[PDB]
Amino acid sequence: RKSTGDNSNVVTMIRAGSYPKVNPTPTWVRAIPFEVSVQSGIAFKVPVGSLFSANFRTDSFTSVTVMSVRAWTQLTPPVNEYSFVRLKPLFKTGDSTEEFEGRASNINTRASVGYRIPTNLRQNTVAADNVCEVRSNCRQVALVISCCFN
Amino acid sequence: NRKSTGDNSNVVTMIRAGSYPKVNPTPTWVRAIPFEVSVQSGIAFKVPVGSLFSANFRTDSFTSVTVMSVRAWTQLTPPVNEYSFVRLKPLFKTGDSTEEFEGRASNINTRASVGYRIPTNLRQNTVAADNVCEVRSNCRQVALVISCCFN
Amino acid sequence: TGDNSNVVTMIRAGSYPKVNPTPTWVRAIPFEVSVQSGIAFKVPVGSLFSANFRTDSFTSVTVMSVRAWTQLTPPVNEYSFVRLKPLFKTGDSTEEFEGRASNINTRASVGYRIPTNLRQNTVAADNVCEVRSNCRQVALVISCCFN
Amino acid sequence: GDNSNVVTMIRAGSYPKVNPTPTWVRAIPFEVSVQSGIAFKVPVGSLFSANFRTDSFTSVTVMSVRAWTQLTPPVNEYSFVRLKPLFKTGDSTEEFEGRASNINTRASVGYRIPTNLRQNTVAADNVCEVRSNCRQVALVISCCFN
Amino acid sequence: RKSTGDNSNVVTMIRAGSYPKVNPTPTWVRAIPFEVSVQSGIAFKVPVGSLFSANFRTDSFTSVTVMSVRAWTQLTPPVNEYSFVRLKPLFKTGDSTEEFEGRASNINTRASVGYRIPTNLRQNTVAADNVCEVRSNCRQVALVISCCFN
Amino acid sequence: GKVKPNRKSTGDNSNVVTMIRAGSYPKVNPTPTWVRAIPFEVSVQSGIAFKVPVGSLFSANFRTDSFTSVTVMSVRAWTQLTPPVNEYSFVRLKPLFKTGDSTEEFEGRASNINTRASVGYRIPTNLRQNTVAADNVCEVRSNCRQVALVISCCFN
Amino acid sequence: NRKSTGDNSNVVTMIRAGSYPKVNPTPTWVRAIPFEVSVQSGIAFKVPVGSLFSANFRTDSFTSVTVMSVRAWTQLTPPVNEYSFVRLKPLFKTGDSTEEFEGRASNINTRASVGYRIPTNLRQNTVAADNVCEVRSNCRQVALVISCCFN
Amino acid sequence: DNSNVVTMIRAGSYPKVNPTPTWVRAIPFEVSVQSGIAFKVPVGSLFSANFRTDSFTSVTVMSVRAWTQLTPPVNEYSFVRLKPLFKTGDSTEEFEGRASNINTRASVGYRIPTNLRQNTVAADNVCEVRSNCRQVALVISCCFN
Amino acid sequence: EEFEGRASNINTRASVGYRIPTNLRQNTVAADNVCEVRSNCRQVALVISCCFN
Ligand SMILES: [Mg+2]
Ligand SMILES: [Mg+2]
């Protein structure tokens, strides 16, 4: 039968009022997953521009406030080795020297690690800027960046 | 309660991330899209859903949308001696409606406003080729604010 | 003790309200169909739009539940029965909701409710369901929302 | 049951009492033209039309009448509108008047018909006299079609 | 009288009454398992018709309301890669763009995605229709679709 | 106990597709069992019992042609046609079992000629084994030439 | 009241019967059937079900019976110097058992008894041709008492 | 108890037995009746292999119920009377019942008090039946012994 | 019924089983069979909870 309260099955009028405040191009909190190629014994600078793309619905943005960064190895490690990945946060005001590392305990398993950016270091970064250096015995690294597009 | 409320520190801190989660590069997005449409005095006007997908709204990677409710305002002044008015007639691919949700301005200098909610049992996707509602008014332009889910 | 005035009273009206000259209408529409022995009859949604029901002004409707009764006596020695197979534009069903009489002189009846996820609009060209019966006519009472 | 996502059987019983032409409580919006200094008699027939889904009715029990000035007033003047209820058993002499305190704003007033006077009216009957300095008055009539 | 306040070991009479409502062809809520072949870099469209088959006892149905969809990689991934799988729901009233993706964190383990269809999109579907686009680096994906046959 | 409160409702619902963080591949079964009330009719001669074949339960008309076995739980019967002139309808059921047929004659008679007669019987749990198309459910005697059955059973 | 000292009356009364009820001229009747069986030394005797069906038990009208529990007693004195004993090996059409539920008398002049219950999942009907169990005993006769459900 | 295999019974002394016990029943059987003529129902009708009671020679009747088994004469509503009978003395009641729908059975029954519940053999009569329908259906609650 | 079970790790066994309802727990002899077994693996290992009698 379905209820009649009221009635919940047909269009109903909305007693709107004054025109509100609008914004066609609002912000957007997201977790952007993407991968990068990494060489052995060399750090790779993760460019912020990768966060802007139609593949994420974010190419309408030009700046992004990074909150946290997480990385997983995306390919198998060398023979006899265990996957490992490292993150060195970068900042326009001053690059860091931390090497947040994670090593797999099962060769067949990924190695993972992340780092949170404190509030006092949460600013906008443009495509030209770099998020962090990535090091890994695996040739590709899977990244998942929590950030705020604006 | 209270205290730290998480971490609240001044430098980067490690995250003991684990197994690669479930991700989605192209998620959904619930939005309130504002956009205008020109109208003539005496003729209805079908609002194309294709107006909701546009780079002006960041809703450009989408091809389908589920509309929840529609609200309309007269964007321009009415003719001389008249009070603004605006009508909305919901439209559905399964069967157009005959409602004419109408609102009128009680002050000539003020907008007319009206809107309608779409019940859950009629909230299916619409693409660019589909329509939303017929709009009537004595004002030559109508401002729409449409609550919908992009997917 | 519950009566108000005996003369007209003023209404301190305000700003012109939101109005709708053509509202919706939740109804229970009764109508009959003619059914042949052993042949299913597609009930046309267009039957619901008619001045006989004050619904000639609608072109769409949301059906909620369908109830059916046999309108005429069944064949000799037989008991009445009636069957409803829901029909949907998105995918016809194969259910055969059947009710039977226990007294030859009595009507057979059965109905089916439509879940909220399948309650979209239908126009005259569409069909509600299939009807089968040993009786030659079936009386239906369709609960529906005109809009 | 609502939680169901498919059709479910109904164990219907006796053929119920039915009515293909039921009644309907409505708020009917429409406008009427008015000349300066002349009262206009509102016809009940303006309530029976396929613009209101009511062309299938012939009688209606009016409950309350509300009016708003639909067009601007004369220069220098504030809008006003009056209503004199009319009844077949004897017209009234009240002039329920409302005025706008801002020239750009509509003037509004309405009256309630008491229970004892809520009888049917037909297309030839008249609801009330409308007076106004604006040339068109919008009316909303809460009534019961039957 | 059963067996004196027990479960009884004998047939017992039922005082049946009027002939009830009946339905020889009732609805059926099911969780259908089946596999689909997926190649590299291309999306496969899952045909709703795969749900109608005598291998699921459902060849008597011509329409079905789908509720949820779960995918699992059915074969091992390419050398050095971690399995993954994506799911893009499809609807007649408007295909979606979500690429619900799930990856494996162990090369020898499956990757699992799943997505639920809201109620307002739970309409029937026939064999000619489709359910979703499947992507995966594995040559085959196992699917378990929770649906309602009617 | 105290199952009185609570509500759940999946914490309300939404309007768009949502991800499911599925896990391991579950256990599955493409050809599961099915509990059913199967309605069908059988023709009866006057004063001659008719053995109801179990094979009637397996038919595409009931969506069960894919089953070759079934466990019967309860049998209910109704006279499907009018009785003889001057007679009140009646129907008898005699349960049949492979391990030993019964001699019961569960009988129900109409108290109005225009009305159906009805009766049914319940199979105890210690007799609810499987049956195939060739086996029989019960005998059916009646004064009406057709009997309507509704057999509550579990298709496996 | 009414008839003055009714309810527990010494007179006939009227029953306001209604619709004709569901009848069954051949119900089931659960029983405890006592009967004897002759036994030879060192030889097992298969007890036939068709010993439950006899006008001596009013059961000549049944053809099938569901056995629930079997009980046995030595019906004649045992050999010289011996204590009575009796053994039961349950038999089933779905598969014969190998148990030997045995009893013995602690006084030579006293009967030896024993029994076994049939679990629910094994309580199907049995016809005359079938067997219930095997009986062994040093006494030339055993008395039985079977709890069974005729139908 | 709750198991799936035979279990032993620690039986004791041989118990009291009875191979031919009593039996409480609700025997149904039909009898022809002529118009304006009462029919004496024979207790013998209660002893038959159709009821499994062919082994009883006596029975204690407790209550008798009757339903018209065939349709009534044209224009007439069905009815049926019961007159209890006893060896110690026949009664003169006529517990009557009349159908309120020509298509419906007429029904009436009577209950026997404990002081009149002695045994009756085949040659004994339970009651006289009268009706306008040529056949009457009887359900007798009785204790076979 | 075809009660199936698959392994989420290639190196790991796939497992599944079925319960027999009380009403179907009769005796079975050597000639009888218990169930059919299908598998892509060449050898399957069983564990049958049963009551010998
Ligand atoms: Mg790795
Ligand atoms: Mg005005």
Ligand SMILES: [Mg+2]
């Ligand atoms: Mg009669």
